[PDB]
Symmetry: C3
């Protein structure tokens, strides 16, 4: 058979698995081994977005699952354990396995049990693994996917950094950024209408202070999976080009491309060389996914500028929106305080500050000053202070026509922003009221609910 | 011109067309010929799923249409006939034809008529053909697509088996598995929301006793089309790898890939080598299509196990669900009996048995025993017998919280299964009631309709 | 760095930009230059379809934006100006730029202002540029995308024609062909449900008298972009094959393919050789886009027939529908007349004539004669004249069963055509009434609204 280098030699190796976005070290090995893999399924609530909880089903406690790294020709003894707290049974299908179900039948595992099967890794490449338990779509949509790398016998070329990034589409009963513990929504899933499309299982998993890092000059390899369940990723890097893209274990390698399609359940290895400092955005270039549903990740490059290659500034909230900042933890706090019944004005102000970036500042500015005659000010705005209910209606329904603000005429259009949730509108408005010599006070989510319901 | 090998020589050849999943034999020919192709359009009702009828519009009585096999450089005389029973006019656009419409204008054919045009096959490759009659989307969605192979002059490499598989997306007024003659739904089609996504024009067309077959060691070529009309297939083989994938007549060939995107109206040739016995699943790896809408087909490999490559078991209902069995003909029977007004308890029991596999057995087991403390039993269940209306509500709406069943406490979650149709719920429950020393009786679809309608 | 050929030499060059579907001439240059690009954003209403207006946001007054053509190694000084009449701020992200945001942060530009940044063009290839201003999806969906070509240092191979074609998906509050100024619809956009999918920013932008042109024998290069924001194009040429397809600046080139996937925000260069005369259709082969939402463009080839390659006729309304004609300007006129309150019978007749092609003529014929016993006549139809309200209901709801028309029995099915708008139905019926010795008179959109509303 291809990839057959004999029986395993040396000692049995207990595989070291890593959580995203990190990868285990190169196998660095000239002989085939028996590799023992132990993976445990855990079902648990985590934050899919700030103040938004979801019950994930995970291989190893993360979405995506633990990264597994072996060598072509290895004999893999795969142990799957299903944690006693689990409610569902689970199993695994690994792409790149040669045999029925990729492991599915022999890895079937009830809560509190363990299963094992053995396989030879005949096929070199980067491969998706996922759960394979009826209803399969439900399991994958709850986060049951990861990557396994089968290295070529001589290993991969050395690089300065290796990272692990995995897209997934998610289906919540609530709309995007609607707070609370969100159930899985089977209707949306059957219709291929995700509420969130994410890298590494949460909004902002790889933005701000959780960005990936490298330096000018260094090479970076990214192992990129698409767990689906349903979407095909127009996978793209903003501001750069991939030196190489290779799908699965495929013999073809594409070079110098910026945009590449990754099928549902597909995987690729991309190589990137850092040339100038700043933030490079990994996105699904089906744009509403990247900018309205959470499908963005940051590779942040540090080092000397090169004005002869690029004279411009680092990314900011104009493009990246509220993810230009280090985090939006103020939103989490304000949500937790709402639940507990201890929500203060300052909680709301801090949450609104986080949310105002991009969403409002793109026209009104970060300091609320506007641009005279073009964008009216929110700083010390007579128009705002004059009527706070009207301000709620402007955010929800937009505004057009001639207005006067601080003694100057505006005649333009503010688009409606109806997708904002009640709490986001309330927090943003509360931030504005308490900034820039505005009169203070607060707007509550419940005030916004009433205005939204009014015909 | 390219692919020009002179005028046709020898005798005129009447092309031998085959129905899916089979392919005509290699042309096996060193000279260009005049090839006469006769294809007849037939409009007819067939089963798109068990007890679910659809009026298909077909090239040659099948979906996909008859496979056409010629040699590059051949002069093809194409005859299209539209059966007198047809209500619509039809025509053909063949990909790989050099000329306006791929044949569309000259092949326009009213019911009871015949058309012909001639073309030279300049372009080697595997190509989609489809109907090209306004409204074009309606025709293609009713099943009017197939494949034509233009062999290279020396022919393709010899293999042990050649098969013909074609994906399509379908748009019914009813939901998935909703019984009866289902009309075409233009709204769903415009929205790209298929109710079914199928290989070879029906659920289970290529599963169970209709699987494709080969033996360990043999090579298999599959001609894979995507008729659409709308979907792009993340085409994938579970448990194996494609040695080669080649799109259309393209010069590039990809090797050792498991997952490949096939555009709407695209076609590929995949090669597969059987290495270990068992069932290999062809799927659209946009998962809800493969596991909720019918997009799965089986290549079943027979021969000696090889425990050094793979130690595990054959696929079963955990992964494949109700398609692990040879067929679900009991469902067809129970549906026909409902229509006729002769539905017996045993009809329902047999239909429910077919439907219980995967759908319920994944947690409750095939024998209904459950797993003590984890999954409650349906076998001899006091809880079930205690209240059959409640059992209907559990299937539709799920169940959580503490319960007692046969003197043991359970505290878990059964997800709702609201996508099940009234008859499926009724048949499944009737099967359960009449198995495992349960008290018998029956649930009717109409009982389930009332429970579903209750607020 | 790669693509570094030294500092700019010679004189500064002011880049010549072209509107679609044309391309600037080859740079024809052996040395790196400083190239100055000046692009102005204009927001304006244009016809997205006949009698249907949309407020586009454009780079240079067109959708797609002005084509930019430079050489690898050039130093580009990019000036973006935002026209004083603009309501929104805008910026640019150019694919192929090496640096954060592809230009986004430094090109941020308020109405009435100008920005500039400089970059070196290190990466050869065809690249999308688009606006990058929060909310990014809204800007791109309003038409803010184009192509930039970075030529290899030796330039591209000479061809006879070079054209510029760009797909986009659009989201209107109204349905397809619903008349009036249509607002942008954020809900449809988030859901990836376009109302229109177009080449070059309008239905018929490249059909009829606006087709692209070449002659038998000539080679044609097309620069093909997919601006999205959301859709992946199954990009296909009907009746031909691409000699070459190359994505972005990629080293891989595919040859002899007819169907190719272009990611959202991707771009390709296709080469085509004209072999026989007639109309070749560029489509997104997700069929409902091409035939129900406007995703078709025509390359019309003139020259001698070659009956040995293809014996058939030129494309007509059977396949192309109402776009087989030179234009549908009568529809624009009738819509303008409705708005002004001067709509005459002849306005309606001419608009209905344009709309009847394909939509009705495929079965009833262009002369309304039908086919005796198979398709009943609309020419001098007693059945039509007998009841005009019934005729309205037939178009909206279809017709089946036995009928008699001009003394002959028909027993067939006319499908419903409910997606037709009130004005289209009214105009079509008014055309029929006033043709072929029918009794004349007229149907108004308001008559059709009442019939449509009746239960
Ligand atoms: C894309 C531009 C844009 C965005 C984004 C935007 N605005 Fe505005 N906003 C405007 C314009 C323009 C007006 C004035 C409209 C007119 O002339 O009729 C306006 C008016 C207003 C007003 C009333 C006038 C004033 O200055 O007091 C308020 C309050 C306001 N915006 C708040 C917000 C808030 C809060 C956000 C975000 C949640 C936001 N806007 C987002 C452009 C924008
Ligand atoms: C994924 C797991 C799973 C699937 C699939 C599933 N069940 Fe259950 N089912 C359970 C669990 C767990 C409970 C107990 C819930 C609790 O503890 O509150 C349950 C409870 C029930 C009960 C009530 C308790 C009993 O044992 O009598 C019935 C009846 C039942 N299921 C029938 C079905 C039927 C019929 C199907 C399929 C149509 C099905 N279930 C599918 C997990 C499942
Ligand atoms: C795909 C076929 C097809 C298309 C498209 C179609 N028709 Fe028909 N039409 C028919 C058939 C068949 C009947 C007769 C149905 C029957 O036998 O019950 C019919 C019947 C009618 C009738 C009533 C009988 C008569 O001859 O007067 C009218 C009026 C009519 N069509 C108008 C139209 C108009 C207007 C259009 C387009 C807007 C249209 N049809 C599109 C096939 C078609
Ligand atoms: Cu699972
Ligand atoms: Cu047809
Ligand atoms: Cu813009």
């Amino acid at each position: 058979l291809p990839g057959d280098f004999g029986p395993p030699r040396g000692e049995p190796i207990h595989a070291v698995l890593t959580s995203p976005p990190l990868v285990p070290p190169p196998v660095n090995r000239t002989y085939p081994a028996k590799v023992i893999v132990e993976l445990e399924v855990v079902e648990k609530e985590m934050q899919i977005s700030e103040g938004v909880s979801y019950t994930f089903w995970t291989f190893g406690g993360t979405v995506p699952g633990s990264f597994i790294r072996v060598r072509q020709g290895d004999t893999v003894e795969f142990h799957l354990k299903n944690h006693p707290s689990s409610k569902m049974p689970h199993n695994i299908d690994l792409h790149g396995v040669t045999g029925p179900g990729g492991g599915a039948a022999s890895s079937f595992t009830a809560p509190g049990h363990e299963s094992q099967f053995t396989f030879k890794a005949l096929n070199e490449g980067i491969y998706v693994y996922h759960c394979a338990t009826a209803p399969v779509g439900m399991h994958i949509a709850n986060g049951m996917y990861g990557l396994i790398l089968v290295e070529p016998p001589e290993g991969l070329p050395k690089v300065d950094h290796e990272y692990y990034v995995m897209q997934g589409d998610f289906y919540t009963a609530g709309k995007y950024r609607e707070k609370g513990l969100q159930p899985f929504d089977m209707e949306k899933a059957i219709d291929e209408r995700p509420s969130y499309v994410l890298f590494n299982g949460a909004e902002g998993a790889l933005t701000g202070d959780k960005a990936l890092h490298a330096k000018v000059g260094e090479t970076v390899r990214i192992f990129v999976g698409n767990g689906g369940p349903n979407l095909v990723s127009s996978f793209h890097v903003i501001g750069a080009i991939f030196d190489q893209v290779r799908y699965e274990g495929g013999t073809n390698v594409q070079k110098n491309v910026q945009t590449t399609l990754i099928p549902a359940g597909g995987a690729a290895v991309v190589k990137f060389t850092a040339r100038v400092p700043g933030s490079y955005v990994l996105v699904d270039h089906s744009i509403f996914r990247a900018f309205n549903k959470g499908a963005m990740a940051i590779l942040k490059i540090d080092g000397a500028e090169n004005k002869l290659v690029y004279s411009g500034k680092e990314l900011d909230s104009v493009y990246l929106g509220d993810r230009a900042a280090p985090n939006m933890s103020a939103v989490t706090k304000a949500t937790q305080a709402s639940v507990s019944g201890t929500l203060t004005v300052q909680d709301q102000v801090q949450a609104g500050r986080a949310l105002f970036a991009g969403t409002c500042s793109v026209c009104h500015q970060g300091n609320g000053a506007g641009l005279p005659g073009v964008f009216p000010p929110l700083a010390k705005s007579d128009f705002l202070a004059a009527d706070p209910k009207r301000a709620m209606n402007i955010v929800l329904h937009g505004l057009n026509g001639k207005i006067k603000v601080n003694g100057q005429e505006y005649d333009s259009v503010m688009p409606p922003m109806t997708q904002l949730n009640d709490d986001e509108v309330a927090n943003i408005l509360t931030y504005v009221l308490n900034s820039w010599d505005n009169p203070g006070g607060r707007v509550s989510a419940e005030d916004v609910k009433k205005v939204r319901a009014q015909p």
